Every structure is written in structure tokens, then in C-alpha cells.
């Protein structure tokens, strides 16, 4: 069905609409370039049901897959994503490799293809080594059903999606070879002949396993059905550069169409980190469509069929044969874009890739060539190419570069996710709302820890904690009193009751009227004269005890204390005779700090706040600590300032650790987090407040300062919870 | 020893601080004044673990215990609540009876207790006594010690050693004073001052002071006595009495008892709880037979016992008896025998108060006492005859106050006093547990936060209708609004579309997008309704379209286009995978049928009880202003005017119960199909109690998935249950039980 009425009734912003899907295979590998002959990783989630990452033929050769998305945009974020977890998961020793032409290739006895036979048996296990890029598009039904209302002509909605499609892929064939030229990545291999320098592309030359001699008919479904189906006397040894994969079997066709087309054509690109560019992606897009849009047998594709292998073989760096028909395509194509308004972008992509035609080396294939020179080796630049990416992507550990933005708790969630091949959807990247499904099993978590197996009243009790403190000290734990007087008279008299404690005015500013007696309610008069001066300040004041003691954050999960976290004030060890500004910017050259929301950890900034403290301690930024002299540099514990925390789950004594777990399950909270407060996290547990108090609880903990803590064990609670909601795994 | 002097350290703030409980007894009876002679109503929860509402022995004579408070202050509300549900509870026909004294006895009833211990006890003890005696209904006074206050006491107190033995001899001490001295607090509160019962006292309106402390008042004989000297003895004397001869320690009936007893004997160890007394009679003149002034009387006085350093010996505690019971006898007008006694005890007593820095208000009350000594008259007994020769006898002002007080109840049905402050969901849920007898507590009046113990199981509610089965995730997923859309378009149901263009040029662009669909196009943000442009049929034209979008661009920065619904909007209330009812609002109005103005016609139509406040009530009245005006200028109306004939008379454009429209359950009247689609959108949520609120064309034709047939309004995790419980013009939806159900099905 080619016509474009859609000019006509102006519809330019349905034929981009669309949908995405893409999978790449990347040989895992040695630093040397050599395949790497081990397994799959085990934490990676089960290679049956995996949806992200995969393995193709060989357990080392691997496959990424991202999901279909509206905007090709989110694709590459995906595609980022997976890269980034793999090569994060991937053993410190084995690598990814950048090219399709595997560089260093073993005997068949040395590739083990963990998961065939006859379809090995006929080309043989090399030959399945290569590695490559499939794109699939598929055009948006919305734009396709107002199209075919407009069509008098087809009384079926399949056969006008079915020719349409059937359209798109005999074009694509016809001028395919463009593509080729374009981008072809494939102009050397280790093994017969060393063939005819360089060549374009070997895949898609003759001898690679992509070149049939046997004509299946793209003109009608029912027609390909037919001779595929009667070649049988099945899906998977017919090569089409453009693939039907829509259904299942072909006969569904008939019945069902065709739903869209996975194209096998490209080679991964050395000079792209994942293999594409969104540029490349784009254009590809671009010129799908001018295949369905250009107005336009199996000749004239199996015409093109011939100038494509023929293109391969050539030499990348001499001018392609038919640059003419390129140039025209491209023109005809620039054509397309003024009519649909394109965005202008695509302009510069289609004008960027014109200058290619006239200049061979901006051409992907030709840029290579010199650069593989270069290396002087196949094996040389891919090796080279595996450290870099690897290497690149070791930068940010904690965060994946696809979504910088969303929380880091949130950010390792998705990690863990995509990891463990659970099917993610993020509802809202902004809200940190995540909808993960694996089987028919479907839990949605929203900032990490809030999860199904949560009740509300939870956090609708710990929230008010008027509330928590009263179901808290009910549960028995002890739980810090606060009193508040109305009125001085009865609070005078109310002396009784009170120990050590601080009465503050309920709003008082310049810290007015705040009286603290540590150690020290130890007489009558001086408790009578704080009162007064707090009551000046407002119409109600505040008697609370006052606590003495470290404070410890227990993460607990289930039945369980998971960590626990604690937390000092910025500082710098004197150990190094180093100018404490020199051993400040020290201790900031490390990737986990960076301002605090965006990274773990905060950078330490020795301005007159921390200048006036250490001059209490008698330095200068100047001045060079005696080793193991910790100077603090700020009396304040949050990590906003630049505070370090560290783990204590294994320091702590497991009494509180229990009580942490005793706390939250008190409160009917499965992920809770408990803030506490304990002079001697050494010395056993008692019922005496002298020991330990609970100071707060939350409704949704960090999991992030836990996950990455400046020192100490991380402990990493993202897959604690990801087992807690699907167990199964 | 004596506390007294140790009011060194300042304890005078920790003396009044207690745990306070209450029992008041009174038997359902008729209108008539005779008693009910009728079964134990079936709404309240069952006897065998109602902890607020039970039957003390007669099926006839029920008695209500209110959970203990840390103030007298709160027990009364709880008092003032149950009290409230009871008289609710009961068929119209039945009333309560306020006095002590029977009013009409029949010859009768049973305990109709499901544990046959229980039957068995009633049985041999109606044997014991008879059934008459036991009639007789009265309160009981709960009074418990701060502990922390006790510690304090003790800490202070050389001479003991050991923490209980303090505790039994401080209990003990106030229990024998208060026996030498309780003459006083009946004299001025008796309450029993009158044929089947007691005949045999020669009456001709010669009543006594009070009949029950009396001989003919069940004591059940003169040989049974326990010392309270020691508890060590005390508990000799009742071991001895039931080895041979009271069938229990239960059975032992005296004027203060101690407690927290599983055995005496048990105190040795575990030491005195607290004390309970039973010297009071129901008073008929306050509402639920008790006030606060006497309650906190009472505690001061109880305090007192234990504030004077004497503690009656022997012969002095069986001499205040001999002194309580004369008294009781007294003829009510005249003047107590030992009236100086009465003045030189309640004289300490001000001095206590002035000792311990005790509040204004209790010097005001002890004070009234002594006025009520210098005259009869006052007193509630002297009080009480002048009463009874009104209506001619004891049993006529009986069922004049009972049907005084049942109708305060029946004054705002549906508020609970208690606890008006309250969101009216809540009061209703309280009201619903109370009945039911799951021990409820409240942790936080104002948040709403409320707890629910039954057995040893217990659920958390706040606000009413958030409980454990709802999820954390479910309120998130309603909160956003937006993930509340992508949620229930999966599932597939309708809801309408919003899409937001920044580019002018891209939004004309992707025009066809939206054609023959009917789109209001709004700006993100304006003033006036400035550049917002309504299409109901659908965009018709590229270019009324692109004036459209023009216009709002003037306006605003981000320009949304969302779908346009048309249909009468409800709201379905879904609890768990059944939807529970269907309510619908409309403009405040009336109907002229009555062929009164409108402003008659209005004024009739708040008459109604649930008119009110709309915050502080279901409904709010239809006011009659410019606003309201200008709506009867368009029907060819006016105030003075009368609408016509059965003719509706809208005075409002928005269907809003805040400006006085009317609520109507539609629970039936609407199609099942919808109904079902409520529960889906809740299972989508994958929250257990939801409200969802549906726009919808037609009631009666049944849903297509198209949004011209259906469409979803917006998703609620905390609906309102009381527009649902009292509908203006529907049929009453109580969902608070649905919901109490679901939280103890075990029930």
C-alpha cells in the first residue's frame, strides 16, 4: 500500500510517531581482546527469563535488549542503562568488545554455547561468533488506522498493514546498501582467505553467514507464506536484512498481519559506547519511512540485493559505486522532511550523511579503517576499545547514567532491577514511581522503599508520633518523655515529676529561654528560674529529657536489622603531615563526593565555620596535623556540611539490633527505619533509659548513605527489598 | 504511716494524679416506668466480651463500665458516649430508669450468661438473697493511686521495707477511714429514699435518707466480717469464710471492696491494684446518674482518708458503720445527727486543698457541701422527696426523667457528644465499636487516630476508613493523579486523557490527533477562564482549532488540552471487592409543591435536625442570599414568590453540599455494570477500602468502554463516609460496620 494522501491531510507528526525495540550482541572478552570462554554470570538474573540481557548462541557472546518505547530517545537511555549494569556486573578480568569481527577466535572444541546442532552443523560454530545491531520499528497504529480510512482502495485493515509493512521492507532491500555504505563496520576477521586490504563490510559480503539463492516472494503475505512454508518441505534459516518478525507463525499472518519489522542489517559501531548513535537511529527512522514513501519487484530488490553484497566487498576508502542512487535517495529524502515538518535536527543528519557520499572518510566504514590502521591490529583497537568503555563507565559507579536525576536510592533500584532481569516501568521519572513485573507477579515500589507490603497506618503512626510514642512505650521500649506546660504555676509545681532535661519555649528564636540540665535536676530554685525565663519567650514551654549519647540509624527490613549507619561531622585525619587544605581537597578527589543530593557525599569546605573550629583546635588550614590527630571540621553531623558515614552494623551490638527489629515491627512497618540513640553501642542492651533511647522512626529510609557509606562495609539493601517483594527468584 | 507530712517534697501535684473506673447499674424499662421484662437488645455486641455495655444479673438490669481514664474528667465522656449508644440501642419502645429504686417489680428474669458458672452463681445467689434485693441498681467508683506517686511515698517511707506491704497498708488506711466516715458521703448523696421491695418499713411518703445502707438493703448477714486491720488478716477472714460459709470472695458484699484480686491472698505478693465503692446511688437528676463535681468529690475525699494521719480501728470502723446506717435512715429534710463530725471532716479537707496546690474549682465544690449542711433542703436526697411529691410518687418522675434523657440522645442522632469535635466519620465509627464492645482507644483526638483491641488481636484506624488492609503503595498511586491515570489505563478502563503541548506550532501540528473528539482547551494556568476554549461536540475545523490553542498560548506558558466529559458525576464507595453504596449531590433547592415561598419553603427544609454546619454536620441549610437570589431572578422566581406546584427551584449552579445541596443514596438505582467497574478501579489500586468517583451519562443503560457511554472522574483513598451514612433524600448507608467487619471478621 504506498500512497501519501497524508501530505494531503498534513498527518507529518503521526509518521514519526512510532515505536522502538533494539538488540545488541557484544562478544564478552579478555582485556587482551581474546573472547572471554567462561560462563554467564550468576548475578545476573536467570538467562530463561532475563529480559534485558541475554546470551545469543555462545554463553560468551551476549545480547542487550531494550524495551519498546514511544521516542527513540528512551531506547538509548535503556541501551545506557543495560551497558552500564553489565559492564558493572561483568567480572573485573572479562570485557566488552566494541566490533561485530570477533579479534582473537578459538578452536570449536573451545566454545562451550552453555544454553542448534544442525544449524551449526551446516555453517559451522564461527561463523556464529559475529556479532551485530537489530533495529526494529514498528509504525504507530494510530497513524496507520487514519490512514487507512483515507485509502478507498483496501477493504482489509491487515492486508493495508500488512502491504504497508511488506512496502517498507521490499524498499528498504531495494536501496539498502546505502545504509551499508553508510555504516558498515565489519572490514576484517582473524582466520580462509585473507581476501581481496580492507573491505567495507564482510557480514553482509559474501562470505559471512548474513549473505540464500532460494527466492521467498515479498509481495503479498499470503504469497510469502506460501513459499516459505512450502521451502520448509523453517522461521529461522531465512535471511532477510529486513525481518517479518510480527507473529509467531506466518500463517498468523494471514490471520493477524503483520505487527512490525526487526531489521538484521547493521554492525555495531566501535566509535559508539553502545554500538549506535541516536544520530545513526534517527536516520534509520528517516529513511524507513522514505522506503514506505516513496512512491516506487522482486527484481528490482533482488537488483538491490546484488548491489549490496557488492558494496560490502569494496574497499571502504574508495568511492561507492553508486553514490548517484544515493545521493538521490538522500535528496528525495531531505524532500520528505520539508513536507512533514521534521524537526531540524533531522535536516542536519541527512545533510551530515550527504557529505559522506562526497567524502568517503566522514563515512562510518572509512573513519574505521584509518583508526584500526592506527591500532595497527583488529584485535589492537577493540581491546584498546573495551578499556575505555569499561573504564568510562566506572566514573559514577553509584549512579547509571541514563537516570542521573532520579534519586540514588531510586537510581540503584533500577540497577538491581535490570540486573536481575525484573521487567521495569518508570511511571514517573520524577516521582520516582517504579511498576515492576516479572511473570504475572506485579509489585509497584515508589521511592525504594515504599512497597506493597507496607499497610498505610504505618506511616500514618510514625508520622504523628503523638501516636508512635504512645504504641512505643505500650510495646514497652523506651521511649524519651516530653511534657508541656500551659501554664508556670502548675508547672512549678509539677517539679516532681522530673532526671535530666531541657525546657525550651515552644517558639522562641536566638535560642531563648532553652535551659539545659544534663546530669542535673538537682535543685528546686534553679528549676523554678528556667521556667520563667522560658516562658517570657512563649505562651507554652517544653520539658524534655535530654540524652547523652552517639546516634545509630538501624535500616531494618522484615524480621531483621539489614545496617546500620553512622554519622560524624566533616573532618580530616591528621595522619598525613599534609596542609590540612591539602588534605582536605584529599579527601575530595573521591567520585562519591560531589554536592550532597546529586552524589552520596558531600565536599568538605574549609570556609570560617570550619576555619573558626579547627582554630579551636589550634590549626590553621595551614597547618600540618600530627599523624592520627583527627581534626573535626564541623560540629554538625549531617553530611550536608561534608559529613562521613560509616557502617556499624557489624561494631553494633545486636541487642539494640533486635530492639530496631523489636521497634518497627511494633509499628507494622516491613521496611522501616529507626533512628536511636545509644552512649555504648558496645555494652549490652537494658531496660534503663541510661542505655539507649529511640529518637525517631522513619516511613521511608535512605538505603543510598547505607549503599554507599564513605567508610565501612556497604551493605546493599536494594536487593533485600527487590527479594522481599518478588521472593520467587 | 502517714503521707501527710510528706508533703515536704511538694507531692501535692502528684496526690490528685489516680486511674479512675465506673459501674453504673440501671434497668431498661418503659415508658410506663415498669420495668422492660424483655430481652437484652441484639445490636449490642455480645455480653460474654462487651467490655463498655453488660447485664450485671437480671437480663432486665444493665450496667455500663467505662474504661479506666487517666482523668475523672474523660469518664465522663466515655460515660456520657456509652450512655448515649445505649439509649440509642434500645427499641424506641424501652427508656432508662434513672432512680435506683425499682419502679414497677415484677414476680421475672435471668443472667442469661452463655458460661454455666455464671448461671449456677446467679442462681445459688438468687436463692441466697432472693431477686429483689438484687434489683436495685447502683454506680460504682473505681479509684486507683498513680503507682509512680506511690513509688514516691514509698521511697520516702523507712518504716516499711518492702514496696507492697506499703501499698496494702496505704489502701487499707483509706478503706477503714473512709468506712468511719462514708456516713458523709451518703447523707449527701442518697438517692434511695422510697412497695413489693421493702414494704414492711411503715411508709405514708415517710421516706428514710437512704434504703439500700439500710438493714432491709441487702447485706447478706450479720456473722460474715473480714478485718481490714491487716491484709494478711483480711485475707485470713475470707480464706476462712469460704472454706466454711460465702460461696466466693465475690460474694462478699461490702461498701468498699478491694481489687485487682484473682484471690485475696494473691495481694501478698502482687500487692492492693485499687479500690472500688459502692455507696452511691444513681442520682436522677443528673443526666447519666453521676456529676463530674460529685465524681472529683469523691476523689477528694478519697484522698482525704488517706491525707489524715488517724486510721479508725476496729471499733471505729464498726462504729462509722453503726453512724452511716442511722444516718441513711434519717428522714431526708432533717439534719444529719452527726453533722459537726460531717463539717470537721470536710473542714481537713480544705485545708488539704490549700496544702497541695489543688485547683479553684475543688474548693468551689466542698464549699457547696458544707452550704448543704447548714440546709437539708440541698441535698440530693432532700432533693429527691420534693421531686417524688411532684408527680405524686417514686415511679412517676422515673419515666418523666427517662424520657427526658432519651430524648437529649435522640437531639443530634447522629453525633456523639462525647466527642463532637470529632469528624462525624469518626464519631460514627466510635459509635459503631462501642456498641459492638471492641475496646477502642483513642491515641489522638485530633489526628484521628484511633485503636482498636479485640482479644489478642488489634487494629489501627485513622480518620475512619484507613486500616491495615489498605497498602501504603495504593494511597501514593491515588495521590499522584497522574499515575492514577497510567495505572487505570492498563486495565483498561476509561479515563480521559490529558495532553500538554509547549509548542504552539507542534500542537496545530498534532491536531489530527484529536478531531472528532470532544477536547476542552484549557492553559496551564489563568485567570477568568481567560483563553479557555469548551468543545462539546468535538474540534470541527483545523482552524476554529488553532484559534483555540491561540488564544490559550496568549495565556499561558504550557498548554494542556484534555478531554472534555459530559454526564451526572458519582461516587461510588468500594470496600474490598464489593462496592459498598452509590451517593449523587445536587444544587441546594426545594420544591414548591407545598405552595409556600420559597423562603417558607427553605425554612422548612433546614428544620430538619441534620441540617447544620457542613463541617461540624451532614448537611448544611439553604440560604436565601444574592447569590442564591439572582439563581430564582432566572426560574421567574423570587423569595416572596412561590414556586409552583411540585416545581424544583434550583438555588445554586454546583451540586455542592457546602453551599447546601442535597446528598441521595442511588445505591440501587444504579446499573451493576458501573458498580463493577468501581470495584475494578479499586483493584487496579490495589486498595481495599477506595471511593471512586465516576462520570456518567445515563444511570439506567448499561456501560460501553467509549467515553461518550462512561468515563472515571477520579480516584479517592479516604472517602466520606458520613454523607454516605445519612443521606438527605437516600436510603442510609452505615459502612462503618462494613468496615469494623472487615477489621474483625472474627467477630
Given at each position: 500500500?504506498?500512497?501519501?494522501?497524508?501530505?494531503?491531510?498534513?498527518?507529518?507528526?503521526?509518521?514519526?510517531?512510532?515505536?522502538?525495540?533494539?538488540?545488541?550482541?557484544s562478544q564478552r572478552v579478555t582485556?587482551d581482546g581474546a573472547i572471554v570462554t567462561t560462563?554467564?554470570?550468576?548475578?545476573?538474573?536467570?538467562?530463561?527469563?532475563?529480559?534485558?540481557?541475554?546470551?545469543?548462541?555462545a554463553e560468551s557472546q551476549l545480547?542487550?535488549?531494550?524495551?519498546?518505547?514511544?521516542?527513540?530517545?528512551?531506547?538509548?537511555?535503556?541501551?545506557?542503562?543495560?551497558?552500564?549494569?553489565?559492564?558493572?556486573?561483568?567480572?573485573?578480568?572479562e570485557y566488552?568488545f566494541?566490533?561485530?569481527?570477533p579479534a582473537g577466535l578459538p578452536a570449536?572444541?573451545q566454545i562451550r554455547v552453555?544454553?542448534?546442532?544442525?544449524?551449526?552443523?551446516?555453517?559451522?560454530?564461527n561463523?556464529?561468533m559475529?556479532s551485530?545491531?537489530?533495529?526494529?520499528?514498528?509504525?504507530?497504529?494510530?497513524?496507520?488506522?487514519?490512514?487507512?480510512?483515507?485509502?478507498?482502495?483496501?477493504?482489509?485493515?491487515?492486508?493495508?498493514?500488512?502491504?504497508?509493512?511488506?512496502?517498507?521492507?521490499?524498499?528498504?532491500?531495494?536501496?539498502?546498501?546505502?545504509?551499508?555504505?553508510?555504516?558498515?563496520?565489519?572490514?576484517?576477521?582473524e582466520?580462509?582467505?585473507?581476501?581481496?586490504?580492507?573491505?567495507?563490510?564482510?557480514?553482509?559480503?559474501?562470505?559471512?553467514?548474513?549473505?540464500?539463492?532460494?527466492?521467498?516472494?515479498?509481495?503479498?503475505?499470503?504469497?510469502?507464506?506460501?513459499?516459505?512454508?512450502?521451502?520448509?518441505?523453517?522461521?529461522?534459516?531465512?535471511?532477510?536484512?529486513?525481518?517479518?518478525?510480527?507473529?509467531?507463525?506466518?500463517?498468523?499472518?494471514?490471520?493477524?498481519?503483520?505487527?512490525?519489522?526487526?531489521?538484521?542489517?547493521?554492525?555495531?559501531?566501535?566509535?559508539?559506547?553502545?554500538?549506535?548513535?541516536?544520530?545513526?537511529?534517527?536516520?534509520?527512522?528517516?529513511?524507513?519511512?522514505?522506503?514506505?514513501?516513496?512512491?516506487?519487484?522482486?527484481?528490482?530488490?533482488?537488483?538491490?540485493?546484488?548491489?549490496?553484497?557488492?558494496?560490502?566487498?569494496?574497499?571502504?576508502?574508495?568511492?561507492?559505486?553508486?553514490?548517484?542512487?544515493?545521493?538521490?535517495?538522500?535528496?528525495?529524502?531531505?524532500?520528505?522532511?520539508?513536507?512533514?515538518?521534521?524537526?531540524?535536527?533531522?535536516?542536519?543528519?541527512?545533510?551530515?550523511?550527504?557529505?559522506?557520499?562526497?567524502?568517503?572518510?566522514?563515512?562510518?566504514?572509512?573513519?574505521?579503517?584509518?583508526?584500526?590502521?592506527?591500532?595497527?591490529?583488529?584485535q589492537?583497537?577493540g581491546?584498546?576499545?573495551?578499556?575505555?568503555?569499561?573504564?568510562?563507565?566506572?566514573?559514577?559507579?553509584?549512579?547509571?547514567?541514563?537516570?542521573?536525576?532520579?534519586?540514588?536510592?531510586?537510581?540503584?533500584?533500577?540497577?538491581?532491577?535490570?540486573?536481575?532481569?525484573?521487567?521495569?516501568?518508570?511511571?514517573?521519572?520524577?516521582?520516582?514511581?517504579?511498576?515492576?513485573?516479572?511473570?504475572?507477579?506485579?509489585?509497584?515500589?515508589?521511592?525504594?522503599?515504599?512497597?506493597?507490603?507496607?499497610?498505610?497506618?504505618?506511616?500514618?503512626?510514625?508520622?504523628?508520633?503523638?501516636?508512635?510514642?504512645?504504641?512505643?512505650?505500650?510495646?514497652?521500649?523506651?521511649?524519651?518523655?516530653?511534657?508541656?506546660?500551659?501554664?508556670?504555676?502548675?508547672?512549678?509545681?509539677?517539679?516532681?515529676?522530673?532526671?535530666?532535661?531541657?525546657?525550651?519555649?515552644?517558639?522562641?528564636?536566638?535560642?531563648?529561654?532553652?535551659?539545659?540540665?544534663?546530669?542535673?535536676?538537682?535543685?528546686?530554685?534553679?528549676?523554678?528560674?528556667?521556667?520563667?525565663?522560658?516562658?517570657?519567650?512563649?505562651?507554652?514551654?517544653?520539658?524534655?529529657?535530654?540524652?547523652?549519647?552517639?546516634?545509630?540509624?538501624?535500616?531494618?527490613?522484615?524480621?531483621?536489622?539489614?545496617?546500620?549507619?553512622?554519622?560524624?561531622?566533616?573532618?580530616?585525619?591528621?595522619?598525613?603531615?599534609?596542609?590540612?587544605?591539602?588534605?582536605?581537597?584529599?579527601?575530595?578527589?573521591?567520585?562519591?563526593?560531589?554536592?550532597?543530593?546529586?552524589?552520596?557525599?558531600?565536599?568538605?569546605?574549609?570556609?570560617?565555620?570550619?576555619?573558626?573550629?579547627?582554630?579551636?583546635?589550634?590549626?590553621?588550614?595551614?597547618?600540618?596535623?600530627?599523624?592520627?590527630?583527627?581534626?573535626?571540621?564541623?560540629?554538625?553531623?549531617?553530611?550536608?556540611?561534608?559529613?562521613?558515614?560509616?557502617?556499624?552494623?557489624?561494631?553494633?551490638?545486636?541487642?539494640?539490633?533486635?530492639?530496631?527489629?523489636?521497634?518497627?515491627?511494633?509499628?507494622?512497618?516491613?521496611?522501616?527505619?529507626?533512628?536511636?540513640?545509644?552512649?555504648?553501642?558496645?555494652?549490652?542492651?537494658?531496660?534503663?533509659?541510661?542505655?539507649?533511647?529511640?529518637?525517631?522512626?522513619?516511613?521511608?529510609?535512605?538505603?543510598?548513605?547505607?549503599?554507599?557509606?564513605?567508610?565501612?562495609?556497604?551493605?546493599?539493601?536494594?536487593?533485600?527489598?527487590?527479594?522481599?517483594?518478588?521472593?520467587?527468584?
Open positions: 500500500k504506498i500512497q501519501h494522501i497524508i501530505h494531503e491531510n498534513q498527518l507529518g507528526l503521526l509518521f514519526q510517531q512510532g515505536s522502538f525495540g533494539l538488540e545488541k550482541e582485556a560462563p554467564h554470570p550468576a548475578v545476573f538474573g536467570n538467562r530463561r527469563y532475563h529480559p534485558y540481557i541475554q546470551t545469543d548462541f545480547e542487550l535488549i531494550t524495551p519498546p518505547t514511544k521516542k527513540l530517545e528512551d531506547t538509548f537511555r535503556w541501551l545506557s542503562v543495560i551497558h552500564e549494569v553489565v559492564q558493572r556486573s561483568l567480572p573485573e578480568e566488552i566494541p566490533l561485530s569481527m570449536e572444541e552453555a544454553q542448534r546442532e544442525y544449524l551449526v552443523k551446516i555453517y559451522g560454530k561463523k556464529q559475529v551485530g545491531i537489530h533495529y526494529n520499528f514498528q509504525l504507530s497504529p494510530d497513524l496507520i488506522t487514519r490512514l487507512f480510512r483515507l485509502q478507498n482502495e483496501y477493504q482489509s485493515a491487515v492486508d493495508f498493514q500488512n502491504d504497508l509493512y511488506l512496502k517498507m521492507a521490499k524498499n528498504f532491500l531495494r536501496y539498502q546498501w546505502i545504509l551499508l555504505y553508510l555504516l558498515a563496520a565489519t572490514p576484517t576477521v582466520s580462509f582467505k585473507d581476501g581481496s586490504q580492507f573491505v567495507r563490510s564482510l557480514r553482509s559480503s559474501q562470505y559471512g553467514y548474513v549473505n540464500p539463492e532460494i527466492n521467498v516472494s515479498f509481495d503479498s503475505v499470503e504469497k510469502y507464506v506460501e513459499s516459505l512454508e512450502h521451502w520448509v518441505s523453517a522461521e529461522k534459516e531465512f535471511y532477510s536484512n529486513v525481518r517479518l518478525r510480527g507473529a509467531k507463525k506466518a500463517r498468523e499472518f494471514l490471520t493477524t498481519g503483520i505487527q512490525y519489522l526487526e531489521f538484521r542489517l547493521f554492525d555495531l559501531n566501535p566509535f559508539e559506547i553502545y554500538g549506535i548513535s541516536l544520530k545513526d537511529a534517527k536516520f534509520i527512522h528517516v529513511f524507513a519511512l522514505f522506503m514506505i514513501w516513496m512512491d516506487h519487484d522482486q527484481e528490482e530488490v533482488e537488483l538491490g540485493k546484488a548491489r549490496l553484497a557488492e558494496v560490502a566487498f569494496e574497499h571502504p576508502l574508495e568511492k561507492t559505486a553508486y553514490a548517484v542512487e544515493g545521493e538521490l535517495v538522500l535528496l528525495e529524502l531531505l524532500s520528505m522532511l520539508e513536507q512533514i515538518g521534521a524537526e531540524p535536527e533531522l535536516f542536519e543528519i541527512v545533510k551530515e550523511k550527504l557529505t559522506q557520499f562526497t567524502d568517503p572518510s566522514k563515512t562510518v566504514a572509512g573513519r574505521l579503517v584509518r583508526a584500526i590502521e592506527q591500532a595497527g591490529s583488529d589492537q583497537l581491546a584498546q576499545l573495551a578499556q575505555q568503555y569499561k573504564a568510562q563507565a566506572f566514573e559514577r559507579f553509584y549512579a547509571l547514567s541514563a537516570f542521573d536525576n532520579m534519586e540514588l536510592s531510586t537510581q540503584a533500584l533500577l540497577f538491581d532491577v535490570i540486573q536481575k532481569g525484573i521487567h521495569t516501568e518508570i511511571l514517573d521519572e520524577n516521582d520516582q514511581f517504579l511498576c515492576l513485573k516479572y511473570g504475572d507477579h506485579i509489585e509497584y515500589v515508589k521511592n525504594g522503599n515504599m512497597t506493597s507490603h507496607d499497610s498505610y497506618i504505618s506511616p500514618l503512626i510514625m508520622e504523628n508520633k503523638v501516636v508512635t510514642k504512645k504504641v512505643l512505650q505500650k510495646a514497652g521500649f523506651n521511649v524519651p518523655q516530653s511534657v508541656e506546660f500551659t501554664s508556670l504555676e502548675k508547672a512549678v509545681a509539677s517539679y516532681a515529676l522530673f532526671r535530666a532535661v531541657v525546657i525550651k519555649p515552644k517558639s522562641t528564636n536566638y535560642g531563648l529561654g532553652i535551659t539545659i540540665f544534663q546530669q542535673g535536676v538537682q535543685n528546686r530554685e534553679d528549676f523554678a528560674k528556667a521556667l520563667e525565663i522560658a516562658f517570657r519567650e512563649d505562651k507554652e514551654v517544653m520539658v524534655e529529657d535530654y540524652l547523652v549519647g552517639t546516634e545509630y540509624r538501624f535500616f531494618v527490613l522484615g524480621d531483621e536489622t539489614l545496617a546500620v549507619l553512622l554519622r560524624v561531622p566533616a573532618n580530616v585525619v591528621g595522619d598525613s603531615v599534609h596542609s590540612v587544605a591539602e588534605l582536605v581537597a584529599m579527601k575530595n578527589d573521591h567520585p562519591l563526593r560531589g554536592d550532597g543530593s546529586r552524589t552520596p557525599l558531600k565536599k568538605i569546605a574549609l570556609g570560617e565555620i570550619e576555619q573558626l573550629q579547627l582554630k579551636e583546635q589550634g590549626l590553621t588550614i595551614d597547618s600540618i596535623p600530627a599523624k592520627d590527630q583527627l581534626v573535626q571540621l564541623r560540629a554538625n553531623s549531617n553530611i550536608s556540611t561534608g559529613g562521613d558515614s560509616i557502617d556499624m552494623t557489624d561494631e553494633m551490638h545486636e541487642s539494640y539490633k533486635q530492639l530496631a527489629v523489636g521497634i518497627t515491627k511494633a509499628m507494622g512497618a516491613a521496611v522501616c527505619g529507626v533512628d536511636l540513640i545509644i552512649p555504648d553501642l558496645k555494652q549490652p542492651a537494658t531496660p534503663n533509659l541510661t542505655s539507649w533511647g529511640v529518637i525517631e522512626a522513619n516511613f521511608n529510609p535512605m538505603m543510598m548513605m547505607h549503599i554507599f557509606p564513605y567508610a565501612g562495609k556497604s551493605r546493599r539493601l536494594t536487593q533485600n527489598v527487590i527479594k522481599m517483594l518478588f521472593p520467587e527468584l
